[PDB]
Amino acid sequence: IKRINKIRRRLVKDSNTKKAGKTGPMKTLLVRVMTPDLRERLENLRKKPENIPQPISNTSRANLNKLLTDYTEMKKAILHVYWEEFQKDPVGLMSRVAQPAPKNIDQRKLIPVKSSGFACSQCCQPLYVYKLEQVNDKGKPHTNYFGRCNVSEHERLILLSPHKTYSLGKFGQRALDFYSIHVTRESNHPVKPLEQIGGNSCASGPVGKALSDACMGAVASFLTKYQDIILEHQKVIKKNEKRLANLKDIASANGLAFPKITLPPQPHTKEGIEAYNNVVAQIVIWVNLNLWQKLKIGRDEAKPLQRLKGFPSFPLVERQANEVDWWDMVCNVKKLINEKKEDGKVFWQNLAGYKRQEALLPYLSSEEDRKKGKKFARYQFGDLLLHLEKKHGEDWGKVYDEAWERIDKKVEGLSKHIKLEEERRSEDAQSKAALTDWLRAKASFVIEGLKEADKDEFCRCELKLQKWYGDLRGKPFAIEAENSILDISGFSKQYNCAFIWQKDGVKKLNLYLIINYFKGGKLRFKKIKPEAFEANRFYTVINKKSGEIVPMEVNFNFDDPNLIILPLAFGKRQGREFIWNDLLSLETGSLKLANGRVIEKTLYNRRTRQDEPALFVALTFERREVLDSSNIKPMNLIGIARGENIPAVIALTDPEGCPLSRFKDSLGNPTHILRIGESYKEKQRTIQAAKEVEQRRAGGYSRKYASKAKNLADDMVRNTARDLLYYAVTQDAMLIFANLSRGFGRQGKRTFMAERQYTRMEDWLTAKLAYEGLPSKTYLSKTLAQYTSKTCSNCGFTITSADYDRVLEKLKKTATGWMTTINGKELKVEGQITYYNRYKRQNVVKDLSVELDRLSEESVNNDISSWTKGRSGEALSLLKKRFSHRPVQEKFVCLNCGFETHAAEQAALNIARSWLFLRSQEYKKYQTNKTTGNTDKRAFVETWQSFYRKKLKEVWKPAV
DNA sequence: TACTTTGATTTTCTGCTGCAGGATGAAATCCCG
DNA sequence: CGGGATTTCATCCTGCAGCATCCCCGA
RNA sequence: GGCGCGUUUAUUCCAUUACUUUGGAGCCAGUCCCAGCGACUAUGUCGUAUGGACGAAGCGCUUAUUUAUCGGCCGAUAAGUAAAACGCAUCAAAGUCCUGCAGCAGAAAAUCAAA
Questions:
Q1: How far apart, in Å, are the Cα atoms of A849 and each of A751, A828, A861?
Q2: A206 phi/psi in degrees, rounded to 5
Q3: Which helix (H) or strand (E) is A244 found in, with range?
């Protein structure tokens, strides 16, 4: 039976247990706080439970709300202070936040710099460089670099990273002493969040220590991203200089006038980035308008400049609160439309004959628009104008007035309907979208007469109307809520937080979470004997740094007006995982509670169809006892192929490489191929289609679809990981993946991020293995991905570009038509090719022989070598498309022997066979020969094909 | 021969992945009943 | 004088190996 | 699309704790009232269920007052109400979180240009 927990139990029973290292694996339990609505849900059951729990009391709710608001305000204040500090002096701050080396690395410094890369801003003295050479565990020598000062107060060892000229290398959350600056009463800093925001009501210790981490973590992350990106920006600047020079030369060679603008130096703020990107945009606009379009020059010969991307913003303080009132903007648009009425009337009425047809060309819909069931407001207004012209003749003076009156009446009706709708309870997004579209159409109609008179005022009007159109269409779907976070630094007597339980029976437990963050509250811990439990008394466990577990009795008062008491809501599965686990018991110390958080975030309520705030509790657990991996030795192989249409296709093989038919398909016949994840893409496309329909109708989709794709993707990833682990454990096999880079995936036009699940599957399988204490190499391995999907599994021949080039070279004409040979096999050049005509938006079918004859109609003796570049290019494009090894995505055809099969299954088998290849002796001789500087892929392909053919002859008997 | 696609830039809103920072207890003073 | 409450401090171990592989192919 | 009942995901032993999701099965989808869109006899008419508003959303099992049939519900058959309690439709899986940025993609609109 395929259960993840069953596989975990089998893994546990098969090996010994050992204590974890300094830090073990971590896992988070996310539960909900028992609120009145959950109780109401519990009271509507057909079979009512015997004991319905009490919800969170009113006093706790008030305390929690106040504390959450105060915590958010203190975070904002501290972040604003450090934003000002960074904006004043970057280098000083990022030198202050750099993490010092441990005060234990006191090996003998050997060599100073052969100097002043940075400076300790505390004393404004340079940090001199000092090296230290050592050997790693793998034998590769490594030199670390450190910065030291002659100040005794600043006699530290700040880590450094060399570049080809030094960087810092690490930013810590605790390097800067936050408590002594902002929390302690002796400090003279003008900003003291606990003393000012909270009104001296919160305990200094816990709240201050939580703020320390919460703010300095974000600051350190921003500093790391900034220092990282400031180097690739330099590389891009240097690269753009050469391209600008080359394009200037090309423009000069063709006798064109290049704009006289200069690229600014490398910027270090957001305004400089915007200026540089504006210059790049102007250059690219000119290049496209004059070089690619008019002269038909290839993009490769005239390469564009590149924008600067990835510059971070300061945390939480640079957010733009684009808060605009909707009806006010509607009124402003109406006002400015009413301003220009006379100018539009004058332009339209006094217009000439033939200029009128071109004046209203953008107002006339196309045939495709008329066919697709619905038209934009512009074309509808154009149809109205045409009918009015037919009605009144050529007297456009009356036409203008009638059109204006009709548009006003329609807009007034829409406005009245929208106001009545929003008065009661309801939102009609379609009506708002229609009103915005009709306002846009009226604005265009009025202002189109100023496109040639005053381009500055016309540009101002266009900018205003464009920004207001964007804002009006985007506001009704703008989210205004944000999560609220309350942190718990740790679970020890210091931080005044407890996770308490009554000992019902011997194993049964009651459950509360207690927070004491207000002055005056009482929460007392008392040490007791290990087995001195009593009824109606709350107990907990305290974990000591030395490995000791101290059971304590926690006593307090329920009616205390300062405490926060939270009852939790969870399921059997979560309880067996964390609270009352059979093996990982937290009373024994095998499981430890690390820290926690109280979260307020939005849940979707379908009863009211709205997002509403809700309270969650997250508790992080650390595993202290893990397994021993020294005895696991898989024997067989499972090659796994990843993709989009099918998330996983797996093939099972013996140690020799021969297929093993042990899986059962739907029909029950033995097989060696399994598919995991089918019909996932179809569901994702269905969700996307629903989203697109709503987006076209109203400009955005409802909150019902907010998290559907992510939930589906998470479900697929977790279930696929379970399936892979189950097969690997039960078949005694090692899993083999392709060596795809992190973040690998297609970045095209109709691509979606929910369909890029390669690294996610990798990470989930690795983490699931890691929680038990085993390394990734125990059950998972990677191999080179080259030529795995391009090798025939029946003959061992791999197709390459050079083969296609040589086939083009040999192709000629006999009395029967075009002919060629590959590896002594004759090819009868015939058959039709159908291509997806994008301009026609259809499928166009052509005949290869006829196309080849046409290409030979302008040529004599059919000499391919005598053709131009473009003609030969079309020739090999046609031959490649007709002789492609992958005519259809899921179908593979071998060109050398005519073998046909499924591409994914063959590639899955070839992945395992390649993993076998990498540890053969042919690869050894190839590696030895490659040391002579011969960097040729051709020899690698030779070795791969030779090994594959040898093994096919020897032991891999092909299917007959 | 031409209508209809495509190239570039700008405005607004949403979601999903990717990568940084993390997953604090021990000990020393100080004050107050 | 003991017990809360507040303040100060400090911790770390990892690769390597070749241009393709869910891209495809295009008026 | 909407409305509800809820099972299985630990072998004696572990909170039918109640959470958040992915599946299976049950029941119900009309009205131009207001808008949107399309065709025109065109400052309106007609049509169209695109969006709001209204309306729809299991079946049995046992208990006692009234009527219809005999001596005038006591004995049974149908109709009308709240509750107690069980059964069938009807069933399998998964969960490692927080903060902060960035990058891609989706959807419209505006302008210039080419073929």
A1: 36, 10, 16
A2: -60, -50
A3: helix A204-253
Strand D within 7 A of A42 CB = yes
Amino acid at A419: K
Distance CA A749, CA A743 (A): 17
- What's the CA–C1' distance between A882 and D12, in Å? 68
Q: Strand D closer than 7 Å to the CB of A573?
A: yes
Identify how the structure was determined: cryo-EM
Residues 828-887 of A with CB under 7 A from strand D: none
CB atoms within 10 A of CB A151: 12
Instruction: Decide: CB of A889 under 7 A of nucleic strand C.
Output: yes
Residue of A113, A230, A121, A222 whose CA lies nearest to A167? A230
Output the distance from A370 CA to D101 C1' rounded to whole Å: 45
CA distances from A625 to A21, A28, A58, A590 (A): 9, 17, 41, 6
Name A residues 742-801 whose Cβ lies under 7 Å from strand D: 747-753, 767-768
Q: How far, in Å, is the CA of A302 from the C1' of nucleotide D115?
A: 20
Alpha-helix runs per DSSP H in A425-454? 429-447
Pick from A153, A212, A219: nearest CA to A180: A212
Rounded to the nearest 10 degrees, the angle between the axes of helix A758-771 and helix A708-731 is 60
* Resolution of the PDB structure in angstroms: 2.9
Q: Domains, chain A, ranges and CATH?
A: 60-89+212-315 (no CATH), 326-477 (no CATH), 636-783 (3.30.420), 801-954 (no CATH)
Q: How do beta strands A812-814 and A817-822 pair?
A: antiparallel
Cα–Cα distance measured from residue A59 to residue A564, given in angstroms and rounded to the nearest whole number: 8
Q: Which strand B bases fall within 7 angstroms of a protein CB?
A: 3-27
At A12, phi and psi to the nearest 5?
-65, -45
Round and report the angstrom distance from CA (A697) to C1' (D36): 10
Alpha-carbon gap, residue A946 to A480, rounded angstroms = 64
| Distance measured from the CA of protein residue A663 to the C1' of nucleotide D55, in angstroms | 54
Long-range contacts, stretch A752-760, CB < 8 angstroms, 24+ apart: A752/A684, A752/A688, A752/A709, A754/A684, A754/A709, A754/A710, A754/A712, A754/A713, A755/A644, A755/A681, A755/A684, A757/A647, A757/A713, A757/A716, A757/A717, A758/A642, A760/A713, A760/A717
Give how far Cα A17 sits from Cα of A126, A547, A725, Å: 51, 17, 20
Asked if strand C comes closer than 7 Å to A844 Cβ, the answer is yes
Query: Do the Cβ atoms of A82 and A93 come closer than 8 Å?
Result: yes
CB A158 within 8 A of CB A100: yes
Enclosing H/E stretch for A281: helix A270-287
The protein residue nearest D14 (Cα–C1') is A580
Query: In the 8-state DSSP scheme, what is residue A303?
Result: P
Smallest CA–C1' distance to D97, residue:
A28
Exposure pattern of A44-65 as b/e (b: 16+ CB <10 Å)? Answer: eeeeeeeeeeebbeebbeebbe
| A157, A120 contact by CB (below 8 A) | no
d(CA A179, CA A115): 33
Between helix A937-954 and helix A903-917 the angle, nearest 10°, is 100
Q: What is the distance in angstroms measured between the alpha-carbon CA of A310 and the sugar C1' of D102?
A: 6
